[PDB]
Amino acid sequence: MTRGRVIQVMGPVVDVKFENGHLPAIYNALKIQHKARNENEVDIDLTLEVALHLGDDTVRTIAMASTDGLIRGMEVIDTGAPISVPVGEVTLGRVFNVLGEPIDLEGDIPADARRDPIHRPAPKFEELATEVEILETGIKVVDLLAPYIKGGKIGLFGGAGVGKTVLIQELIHNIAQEHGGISVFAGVGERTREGNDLYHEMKDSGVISKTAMVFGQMNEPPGARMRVALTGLTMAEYFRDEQGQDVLLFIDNIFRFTQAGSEVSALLGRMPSAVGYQPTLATEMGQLQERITSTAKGSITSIQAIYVPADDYTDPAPATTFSHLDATTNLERKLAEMGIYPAVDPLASTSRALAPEIVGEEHYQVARKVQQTLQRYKELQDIIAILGMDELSDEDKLVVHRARRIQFFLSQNFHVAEQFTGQPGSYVPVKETVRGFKEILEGKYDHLPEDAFRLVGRIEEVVEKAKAMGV
Amino acid sequence: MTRGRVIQVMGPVVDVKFENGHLPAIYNALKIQHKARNENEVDIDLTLEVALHLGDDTVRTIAMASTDGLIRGMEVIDTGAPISVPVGEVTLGRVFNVLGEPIDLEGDIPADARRDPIHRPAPKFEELATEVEILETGIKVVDLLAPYIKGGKIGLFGGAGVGKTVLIQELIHNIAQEHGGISVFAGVGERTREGNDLYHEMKDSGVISKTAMVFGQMNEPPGARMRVALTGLTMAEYFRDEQGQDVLLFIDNIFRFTQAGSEVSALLGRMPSAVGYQPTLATEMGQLQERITSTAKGSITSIQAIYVPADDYTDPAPATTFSHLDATTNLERKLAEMGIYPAVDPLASTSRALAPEIVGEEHYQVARKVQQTLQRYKELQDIIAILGMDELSDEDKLVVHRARRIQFFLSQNFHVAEQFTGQPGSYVPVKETVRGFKEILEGKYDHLPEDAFRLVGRIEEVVEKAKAMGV
Amino acid sequence: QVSDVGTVIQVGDGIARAHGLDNVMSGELVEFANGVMGMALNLEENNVGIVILGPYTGIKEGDEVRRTGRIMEVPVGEALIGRVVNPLGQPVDGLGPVETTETRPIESPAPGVMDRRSVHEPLQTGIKAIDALVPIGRGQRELIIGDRQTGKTSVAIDTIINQKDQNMISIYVAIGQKESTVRTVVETLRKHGALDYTIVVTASASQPAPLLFLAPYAGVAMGEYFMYKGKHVLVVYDDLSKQAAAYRELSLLLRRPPGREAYPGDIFYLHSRLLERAAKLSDAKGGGSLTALPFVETQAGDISAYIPTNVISITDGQIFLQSDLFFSGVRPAINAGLSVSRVGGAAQIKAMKKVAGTLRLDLAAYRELEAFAQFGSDLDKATQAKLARGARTVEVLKQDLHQPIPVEKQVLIIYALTRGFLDDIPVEDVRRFEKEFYLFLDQNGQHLLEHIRTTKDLPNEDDLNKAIEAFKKTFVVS
Ligand SMILES: Nc1ncnc2c1ncn2[C@@H]1O[C@H](COP(=O)(O)OP(=O)(O)OP(=O)(O)O)[C@@H](O)[C@H]1O
Ligand SMILES: Nc1ncnc2c1ncn2[C@@H]1O[C@H](COP(=O)(O)OP(=O)(O)OP(=O)(O)O)[C@@H](O)[C@H]1O
Ligand SMILES: Nc1ncnc2c1ncn2[C@@H]1O[C@H](COP(=O)(O)OP(=O)(O)O)[C@@H](O)[C@H]1O
Ligand SMILES: [Mg+2]
Ligand SMILES: [Mg+2]
Ligand SMILES: [Mg+2]
């Protein structure tokens, strides 16, 4: 038997002293289970994760829940292993917290079910997969300018209130209902209201029978917010490895993991880094990101939403995250303010799949021509705002005329955005969007008013909208 | 016995050790009186104020004068009470320092006179009075766009050399000379020459018989610069409460109070805040400002000049004082350099009294329309800066034509400024101000040159000086 | 009579260090010898760090500190309605004691994923711009953000007043304001009759920093008391930036290392923990709701600052007020491009949804087109029509202070605007058009108003068109 005792409580960080030669290993889970001795105490059931060996038989830990109620001298139990969560068919259709305990009040998991440790090393260089295959989403801008890759890593960047969650929900709607494999959703430091809405939508649509959900939302302490992602990841890794299934992994906001680490860094006692982050930012990000990958045994295609603090794309967290992704979508409130949704930046967004030998020569040429036109339009705005439109050459006037229509046609009405747009959404095949943009570039629709191109879908809908407007 | 001993001397901060069970309370005053025992010592007469309890019977204090000559082991006397300054009829016509000692060479105050502690809690919620009444000042921009409130708090913001002191002197000349109540002037961290000039001016004009003055000018140590404003406020509170008088309170520069606090805070051992300021910046400012208020017994109206360091209005010290003011006038170096005085920013300055039910419907309409034209003029400044007025539309040309004349007519010649230039000052009633600005807005004087609107006063003087020049 | 005891080691700036108190509990209330209360925050190896909730002048080194055995708590009950209290529940209005017989923890868990229900019922503020562009529902958290002197307090006061007949408890929490300003707000509420269902929690600028830090939690606990009984609660935090400053001050005084802009590491967790406790409960939990209106004051309109972005990332939408709009004549000066509601549509009456589903997107497009057309010289017919419609919409959305408008009249004027009945009216005349139209509805369109009010849906479009055309014939263009 080996028991510790609490010696110091500083917010979410707790120090425990053990007997000599019986220290728990790093990342081991500790349990505090205290029954109130009298009316001046409260009952406690708390879980801790070991972080540092302070020396002198002392360990510094991070709590998975609120530390209010703790008293110095409380007994601590060492479980001898990291946090372990159930895996397998049992997890499908259920909703879990960070510790692997179901929260949907459908019943407890049997105590003899298999449980896997939260921490493991990343797959090796030998066992990776590098094939590139297009994943069609039905979204015009994504399918044209930055295609997604099956089994790859997709990141959605954006500041506060630009459309990351709406884009995630639209992707779930378009992809997960016919994927044919397994889907896992991880909520990391987001709104409980959004989590409840997504759960009820999935339950109504029937996808819930094929999905496992884990939630670590904003109200939770930093330890939970920084381990919920690993819980979801190990649940997905079981299906990748033991069954060879294709897995869809949606992460609600991966920036909160870094944010929680930075919240606890100073209390752990580490010197601050450049923008107030922890020194180990890159290493902590890599140890998590490198596990989310496809292997020979199975493929995981993952879509992650990444918050950009204060709209600054040079911030260390998004700047470090950029190197871990195969395809990238950049959202700008400059476009969001103008009424264009999903507000994707057509130039900053990149994808490894945009090559002539992957998407086709015609698709490649159309995409590059669209980007060239938009880039040219960007430069003209500075001189337009000063000297007016009349002083432009006829070529520049035509460039502006077509660029405005292209930028409006990159908008789309989503199914999950009826509450915001008042109209049902649309699904656009990639062949259709390529042909429509080719026709716009060729000038087939120069006579159409530019407002007819907003939030429509296929190119024929522009004609119908303009006819309704009386053109 | 209640005898202490000096332990550490670090500039204006002194550590004193007492016997167990005899520590002085926080804010108590301590006296050091030492006679030179030999030729390697100096005589000392110093006053200290308790700030912290360090433990081990040690107290950390702030000195009210220079600490040169202090030696470890000197005896310290505990007075058992905070700093106490004389109050009542005896203070009228006198000049005091931070300790309540007269400095006008008119004789010492008898030792049996009533004197009150410097530190006290603020008035209760139920004691306050909230009625709003306009205070006419005779200054066009103040009376039109940001009326001053009788019994309220008024702040004047500005950088170095913009006009805060001149505006204070003009307000004193226009209001205090006929106020009929009691006036108190507090000089905090300003020029000694200015205090001498103000004293002689008041003595010559006879206002000295009903005013009291306290000086804490720039040459003083930070402790005196911190407590001089509280001394003045303590003198004013007596007249507010015990006699039910109406009190004018002029504070020469309230920024120096927080600046001295920040100078002291480093040596007290506190961790620095955002821009090197003290962590307790907001609480100290709140505790000073909440005492300056009108109650049922009497009313105190205060006019405070606030220095803006490096012309940065986002600096924490100017930023935190905004919430304590009922009316603000913001001075701008850009306006001051263009010859516009008092150089009040017409859009940034605000007042609670600008409402149709307080100032009147036509007053409100005229003020709002003036502000609208000035905003529209401000929006065009880049276009005029690059390429002038030639490419503006006809509406914008008329906007500029009206706005330049309005901006110039907001200037005025002050009575006090007659020493800089031979032009005598003017007093403009608010009815005249409203009528003149309404006439300008209606387009009556579009044919007059814009230079005829500078520094005149009433609208008829514009016509007179336009006639005097070429027209 | 026995109690665990400690002794004071350090006193200053509202922070105390205590020796002893071996069995003290993290977050527990403690009381000093002279009767001032405190809360234990740091449980170190040999000393306890305490924040003092009151005047620390009378506390000296060597004094006695006593345990209470209670986690930080505030009184709750119906007896607080119509009263002005401090964060500890002590009355400050001078109207006698408060007879509460129950208390709630100041730190409590937020309702979980399974405990909630989607927001589906509107909270009418009486302001056309808010009720049309950025709808607010019961259980939502909407941020009101802008520079000083832009109308943030006016919006909240109007919203509280408009809840008079809608059976809702309001709680107004003032952090770091002048007591005179708080008294002015209280008198305005009393004059308009809203004090019969409102609790006012105040923590002025002269109070110690821990009270400013604790005030919103006390307010939200008082709200939760009614929430879990099935009631509906409205809570207003008049400035979250001021508790951010107070918490920074406390953290620096407690020797906690700083982060960005000297703020502590968990400055985001503070506000997220506070605001996650507002929710719409499910039917199994009683169906009660609490809805919050946090305030943030920006500097020079910089919406992309640290604290503003932290708060924006938490709430379900924001209303951004701009000084340039304020002075250009448009009030309450809501920037349609930068404002958004994350619950929109679901928090609206059916008629309002029908008439204004796309209004915010239309305004954003109009602003873009107005900016663009300033450079050109020969606009075409479509761009002329869009600009005219946008200008008319902007003029319709204007409103005066303390002038509530019923939703059944809001929907009718929005219908008239969006169906083109205002196209022949000059821009300068549409406000008088709206006024005379409301009078005409009061005189001759009572059946339409009653139908909307009872059904939550528009009448048949033929009769409503006939009424509009009759008013058009009556109206004279000046
Ligand atoms: N109304 C005015 N008319 C003419 N000149 C003025 C006026 N106001 C200010 N000035 C000029 O500006 C100078 C600075 O004025 P003032 O002493 O009031 O500045 P300040 O803001 O108080 O400066 P400081 O920070 O040095 O105290 C004056 O000496 C004078 O030359
Ligand atoms: N819709 C409106 N129409 C006219 N005046 C308005 C309107 N809304 C607000 N005001 C006025 O604008 C001023 C500022 O309003 P308010 O005090 O509510 O703003 P605030 O942002 O809360 O201010 P503060 O930063 O001073 O706390 C007040 O004088 C108020 O009467
Ligand atoms: N495709 C879209 N169509 C219409 N509105 C949208 C769309 N995407 C985003 N929005 C608007 O943006 C707001 C915030 O988007 P959200 O999903 O919260 O993004 P984030 O997660 O980055 O805050 C939503 O309330 C919605 O009104
Ligand atoms: Mg989101
Ligand atoms: Mg000066
Ligand atoms: Mg306000």
From residue B211, alpha-carbon distances to B205, B242, B246, B247, C429 in Å are 12, 17, 12, 10, 56
| Alpha helical stretches, state H, A181-254 | 192-205, 222-242
Pocket of ligand 2 (CB under 6 A): B 352, 355; C 148-154, 331-332, 400-401
The alpha-helical segments, DSSP class H, found in A92-153 are 140-145
Under DSSP, is residue B341 helix (H, G, I), strand (E, B) or coil?
Answer: coil
Candidate from C9, C179, C208 with C-beta closest to B290:
C179
B352 CA from centroid of ligand 1 (Å): 27
User: What single letter denotes the amino acid at residue A353?
Assistant: A
Sign of the dihedral defined by the CA atoms of residues A120, A122, A128, A130, in that order: positive
Annotated binding site of C for ADP: 341-342
Residues A95 and A80 in one domain: no
Q: Is the peptide bond before C294 cis (omega within 30 degrees of 0)?
A: no
Residue C66's beta-bridge partner residues?
C5, C31
- Give A419's contacts in chain C (Cβ within 8 Å): 343-346
Q: Which domain CATH number covers A53?
A: 2.40.10.170
Q: What is the distance between the alpha carbons of residues C297 and C275, in angstroms, rounded to a whole number?
A: 17
Q: How many other CB atoms sit within 10 Å of the CB of residue B45?
A: 10
Active site (annotated) includes residue A153: no
Closest by CA to A95, choosing from C280, C277, C113, is C113
Q: Are residues B74 and B89 in the same domain?
A: no
Residues A80, A215 within the same domain = no
Tally the C-alpha atoms within 13 A of residue C218's C-alpha that lie toward its C-beta: 28
Q: Specify the resolution in Å.
A: 2.5
Residues A162, A132 share a domain: yes
What is the DSSP pairing of strand A327-330 with strand A153-158? Answer: parallel
- Would you say the CB of residue B159 lies under 6 angstroms from ligand 1? no
B437 CA to chain C: closest CA distance, Å? 17
B384 lines ligand 1 (CB under 6 A): no
Among B166, B190, B192, say which to mutate for ligand 1: greatest number of ligand atoms within 8 Å of CB. Answer: B166
Q: How far is A10 from chain B (nearest CA, A)?
A: 19
Give the nearest chain C residue to A277 (CA atoms).
C259
Choose, out of A382, A386, A389, A391, the residue to mutate when testing the contact with B (most B CBs < 10 Å): A386
> Is residue A32 a contact partner of residue A43, using CB atoms and an 8 Å limit?
no
Q: Which is nearest to B412 in space by CA: B141, B137, B135?
A: B141
Closest among B455, B262, B191, B469 to B341, alpha carbons compared: B455
Atom 29 (ligand 2) nearest CA: B352
DSSP secondary structure letter of residue A65:
S
Single out the residue in A38, A58, A84 at which a domain terminates.
A84
Rounded Cα gap, residues C426 and C423, in angstroms: 8
Give, for ligand 1, the residue of B140, B142, B156, B162 to mutate: max count of ligand atoms closer than 8 Å to Cβ: B162
Q: Single out the residue in B312, B328, B359 at which a domain terminates.
A: B359
Q: Are residues A291 and A384 in the same domain?
A: no
Atom of ligand 1 nearest to the CA of B190: 27
Contact yes or no for B270 and C245 at CB 8 A: no
**Is there a contact between A454 and C112 if contact means CB atoms under 8 Å apart?**
no
Write out residues 30-59 of C within 8 Å (CB-CB) of A: 42-45
Q: Are residues B280 and B392 in the same domain?
A: no
Task: Indicate whether B386 and B464 sit together in one domain.
Answer: yes
Distance, in Å, from the CA atom of B187 to the CA atom of A106, rounded to the nearest integer, reads 73
Instruction: Measure the CA–CA gap between C155 and C160, rounded to whole angstroms.
Output: 9
* Cα B336 to averaged position of ligand 1 atoms, centre (Å): 9
Spatial separation of the C-alpha atoms in residues A447 and A397, rounded to whole Å: 14
Q: Report CA dihedral (C145, C146, C149, C155) to the nearest 10 degrees.
A: -30
Is B407 a pocket residue for ligand 1 (Cβ < 6 Å)? Answer: no
B37 is catalytic: no
Task: Specify the 3-state DSSP secondary structure of B303.
Answer: strand
- In order, the DSSP letters of B124-168 are PGGGB-----EE--S-HHHHHHS-EETTSEEEEEE-TTSSHHHHH
Please tell me which residue in B94, B115, B153, B164 is annotated as part of the active site.
Answer: B164
Same structural domain, B226 and B107:
yes
Q: What CATH number corresponds to the domain at position B174?
A: 3.40.50.300
One domain, residues B427 and B458: yes
Catalytic residue among C66, C116, C342, C389: C342
Residue A373 structure tokens: 């036109």
Per the structure block, which two tokens stand in for C460? Answer: 């048949």
Report d(CA A336, CA A166) in Å as an integer: 13
Q: Produce one character per residue of A386-415: b if its CB has 16 or more CB atoms within 10 Å, e if not.
A: eeebeebeeebeebbebbebbbbbbbbbbe
Nearest CA in chain A to C372: A385
Residues A444 and A419 in one domain: yes
Q: How many Cβ atoms from other residues are within 10 Å of residue C178's Cβ?
A: 22
Query: B165 CA to middle of ligand 5, Å?
Result: 4
The position carrying tokens 């409203």 is B434
Interface test with B, best of C8, C10, C13, C241 (most B CBs within 10 A): C13
CATH number at residue A385: 1.10.1140.10
Instruction: Let me know whether B426 and B369 are in one domain.
Output: yes
Structure determined via: cryo-EM
Q: List the structure tokens of B86.
A: 């004389």
Beta strands C102-105; C73-76: pairing state: antiparallel
Task: Give the active site residue among B17, B120, B191, B438.
Answer: B191
Residue pair A367/A354 in contact (Cβ under 8 Å)? The answer is yes
Residues B150 and B225 in one domain: yes
One of A140, A153, A164, A227 is an active-site residue; which one? A164
Q: Of B122, B319, B371, which has the smallest distance from its Cβ to C327's Cβ?
A: B371
As a whole number of Å, the CA-based R_g of chain C is 26
Smallest CA–CA separation between C346 and chain A, in Å?
Answer: 6
Q: Does A451 touch chain C (CB under 8 A)?
A: yes
Indicate the top mutation candidate among C125, C150, C323, C325 to test ligand 2's pocket, ranked by most ligand atoms within 8 A of CB. Answer: C150
Q: Counting Cβ atoms within 10 Å, is residue B106 exposed (0-12), middle (13-18) or buried (19+)?
A: exposed
Q: At a CB cut-off of 8 Å and minimum separation 6, what does B46 contact?
A: B31, B32, B63, B64, B65, B67, B70
How many angstroms from the chain centroid is the CA of residue C317?
A: 11
The type of residue at A186 is A
Is there an atom of ligand 1 within 6 Å of B161 CB? yes
Domain ranges, residue A71: 3-84
**DSSP for C61-126?**
TT-EEEEEEEESEEEESGGGTT-EE-TTS-B-SSS------EEEESS-PPP-STTB----SB---S
Nearest residue to C275 (alpha-carbon basis) of B390, B33, A192, B218: A192
Residue A75: enclosing H or E segment and its boundaries?
A: strand A75-78
The phi and psi torsions of C145 (rounded to 5 degrees) equal: -130, 140
Q: Which residues of B360-383 are buried (b: 16+ CB within 10 A; e: fewer)?
A: eeebbebbbebbbbbbbbeeeeee
Distance in angstroms (rounded) separating the CA atoms of residues C305 and C296: 11
| Chain B contact set for A386 (CB, 8 A) | 383, 386-387
Q: Count of domains in chain B?
A: 3
Neighbours of A351 (CB within 10 A): 24
Last residue of a domain, one of B30, B51, B84: B84
